[PDB]
C-alpha cells in the first residue's frame, strides 16, 4: 500500500540545486583572509566533475527504497526496504543521452509521467550499456565514436518496448531533436567544466563499423575575472578522458492530427531534473512517529 | 526554425482584462523558458515576466499584482494575461524565448522574438 | 535593481563610419548577462548580441560587443544604410530582466 511518485520528489530538486552550487563554487576565486592565524592563502577548489555522492535522511526521517522488479516509479509498491541513504550516485550533466547510469534490472524499461500526455518526457533505462568515447583536440578535432551495429540494435530494442507500450500494430521512428537551445538541439555534456556539443542526427535517424559524432568545446570564459590576468594557461586539459557509458536516454514524442499508427520519437526531453531524476527514481524520502 | 506567433484582441475596454497566446513552431515550449514583453508607442521596451516549461513564473514587480503567465505545453503555446486595462496599458506586445537558458550553461538572452500584436485600450 | 543607462539619447552618421553606443549599470553586472537588441522600425527586436561580446548567429560581423562591469559597448566598424535602428542593451539579474531606454541610430546622406 506505499505509494511513489518519481515525478514529484523534492529530492531531485534538491539534488540539482546541489549540483548547480557545486558549479558556481566552482568558478568563485579565493577570497583573501584575515588574521595572523591563517596556515596559507591558498584554499581548495574542487573541479567541476561526477562526485561521488549519497543522500541521508536525518533522524526522524527515513528513506523508502522500492524494490519492485520492473518498477513503474509511480503507484504502489509491495517489496520496500527502508534505508538511511541512497546508492552513490556519481551525476553526470548531459542532455539528450543519459551517461554513467544505472542500467534497467533485466530488459529495457521506459518511464513517463503519463504516455497519453505527449508532453510529458519519456525516460529510457537501459538493460544493457553502450560505450562512447571523446576526447579533447590535443592542446584531432573534438568528436566521439560508437559502436554502430550496437546502436542500432538498442534503437531496435527499444522501439520494441515502445510498440508494447503503444500498441505494437504502430511504426516507430526516430528523428532528430527540433528547434531549441544549442545544449537541447546537440547532446551536449560536461568534462572537467568543458562542455561537449554532438551532432546527433546519426543517432536519431532510425528505421528499416562504428558512429563518429561531430563536437565544439564551448569553455569556461569567466566569470569574475576582470582585470586580472598575470598567469599562464589551464593546467590539465591536453586530451581529456570524456569516454562513458550510455545507460539511457531522454525522449519526447510528436502529436499532430496527421500520424497514423506512425509514432515520432527526439532526443532530448524536459530539463536535467529529469536527469537526476533518473537514479533517484526508485527513493523517496518520509517522516517516522 | 523556431516561430512565435502571438495572437489576441486587438481592442480591450477600460478596466476590462487582456488575454494574448503565442504560439510556438519550428521548436517546442518543453525545456524552454517564455517571456512577455510590451513597447508603449514611441516608447521603450519593458519586460513583463516568464514562465518556465514547468508551469513555475516570474513577474515584473511593478505589474505583478495584475499578470497570469499560463503554458498549454500539450498545444505547444504560452499565454499573457493582464488586469484592469487602461490607456497606459497600450503597447505592443511580444512574446519571445528567454530569456533564461533551458540549462544552467546555456546563454541568457530574448530569441526567436514574435512579430508582436498591437493592443488598443478603448471603449 | 539594475537600472540601464544609454550611450547617447541620438547618435547620427553617415554611411561607413563607426558607430560607438555605450551601456551604463547603475550598479556592476557580470558579461554572461548582458546583451543588445537592434529593432528596425516596424519589427520586433532582433538579438544581435548575448553574452556581452558573442554575437548572434546570423548577424554581421560588423557589429561587435565589449566592455564588463559597469561599462558595455556597442560597436558597428562600418556603418550601413539599413543599420537604421534603436538599439537596446539588456541585462537579466536577480529575476528581474531590464532594459535601456535605447539609442535612436540617425543616418546622414
Known amino acids: 500500500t506505499e505509494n511513489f511518485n518519481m515525478w514529484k520528489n523534492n529530492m531531485v530538486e534538491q539534488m540539482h540545486e546541489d549540483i548547480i552550487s557545486l558549479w558556481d563554487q566552482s568558478l568563485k576565486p579565493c577570497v583573501k583572509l584575515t588574521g595572523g592565524s591563517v596556515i596559507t592563502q591558498a584554499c581548495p577548489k574542487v573541479s567541476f566533475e561526477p562526485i561521488p555522492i549519497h543522500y541521508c535522511a536525518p533522524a526522524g526521517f527515513a528513506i523508502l527504497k522500492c524494490n519492485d522488479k520492473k518498477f513503474n516509479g509511480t503507484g504502489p509498491c509491495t517489496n520496500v526496504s527502508t534505508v538511511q541513504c541512497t546508492h552513490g550516485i556519481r551525476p553526470v550533466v548531459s542532455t539528450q543521452l543519459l551517461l554513467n547510469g544505472s542500467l534497467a534490472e533485466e530488459e529495457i524499461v521506459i518511464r513517463s509521467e503519463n504516455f497519453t500526455n505527449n508532453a510529458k518526457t519519456i525516460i529510457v533505462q537501459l538493460n544493457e550499456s553502450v560505450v562512447i568515447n571523446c576526447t579533447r583536440p590535443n592542446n584531432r578535432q573534438a568528436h566521439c565514436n560508437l559502436s554502430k551495429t550496437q546502436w542500432e540494435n538498442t534503437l531496435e530494442q527499444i522501439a520494441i518496448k515502445l510498440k508494447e507500450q503503444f500498441g505494437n500494430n504502430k511504426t516507430i521512428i526516430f528523428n532528430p531533436s527540433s528547434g531549441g537551445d544549442p545544449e537541447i538541439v546537440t547532446h551536449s555534456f560536461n568534462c572537467g567544466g568543458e562542455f561537449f556539443y554532438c551532432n546527433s542526427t546519426q543517432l536519431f535517424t532510425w528505421n528499416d563499423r562504428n558512429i563518429t559524432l561531430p563536437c565544439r568545446i564551448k569553455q569556461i570564459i569567466n566569470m569574475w575575472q576582470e582585470v586580472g590576468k598575470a598567469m599562464y594557461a589551464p593546467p590539465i586539459r591536453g586530451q581529456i578522458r570524456c569516454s562513458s557509458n550510455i545507460t539511457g536516454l531522454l525522449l519526447t514524442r510528436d502529436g499532430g492530427k496527421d500520424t497514423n499508427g506512425t509514432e515520432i520519437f527526439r532526443p532530448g526531453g524536459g530539463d536535467m531534473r529529469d536527469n537526476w531524476r533518473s537514479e533517484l527514481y526508485k527513493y523517496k524520502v518520509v517522516k517516522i512517529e | 526554425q523556431v516561430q512565435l506567433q502571438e495572437s489576441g484582441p486587438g481592442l480591450v475596454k477600460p478596466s476590462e482584462t487582456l488575454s494574448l497566446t503565442c504560439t510556438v513552431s519550428?521548436?517546442?515550449?518543453?525545456?524552454?523558458?517564455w517571456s512577455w514583453i510590451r513597447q508603449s508607442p514611441g516608447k521603450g521596451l519593458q519586460w513583463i515576466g516568464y514562465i518556465y516549461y514547468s508551469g513555475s513564473t516570474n513577474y515584473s514587480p511593478s505589474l505583478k499584482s495584475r499578470v497570469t503567465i499560463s503554458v498549454e505545453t500539450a498545444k505547444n503555446q504560452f499565454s499573457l494575461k493582464l488586469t484592469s486595462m487602461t490607456a497606459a496599458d497600450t503597447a505592443v506586445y511580444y512574446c519571445?524565448?528567454?530569456?533564461?537558458?533551458?540549462?544552467?550553461?546555456?546563454?541568457?538572452?530574448?530569441?526567436?522574438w514574435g512579430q508582436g500584436t498591437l493592443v488598443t485600450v478603448s471603449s | 535593481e539594475i537600472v540601464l543607462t544609454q550611450s547617447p539619447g541620438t547618435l547620427s552618421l553617415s554611411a561607413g563610419e563607426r558607430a560607438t553606443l555605450s551601456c551604463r549599470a547603475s550598479?556592476?553586472?557580470?558579461?554572461?548577462?548582458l546583451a543588445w537588441y537592434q529593432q528596425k522600425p516596424g519589427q520586433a527586436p532582433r538579438l544581435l548580441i548575448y553574452?556581452?561580446?558573442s554575437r548572434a548567429t546570423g548577424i554581421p560581423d560588423r557589429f561587435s560587443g565589449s566592455g564588463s562591469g559597469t561599462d558595455f559597448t556597442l560597436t558597428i566598424s562600418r556603418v550601413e544604410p539599413e543599420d537604421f535602428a534603436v538599439y537596446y542593451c539588456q541585462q537579466y539579474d536577480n529575476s528581474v530582466c531590464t532594459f535601456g531606454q535605447g539609442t535612436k541610430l540617425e543616418i546622414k546622406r
Open positions: 519550428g521548436g517546442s515550449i518543453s525545456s524552454h523558458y
Open positions: 553574452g556581452a561580446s
Open positions: 519571445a524565448r528567454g530569456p533564461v537558458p533551458a540549462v544552467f550553461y546555456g546563454d541568457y538572452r530574448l530569441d526567436p
Open positions: 550598479q556592476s553586472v557580470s558579461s554572461r548577462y
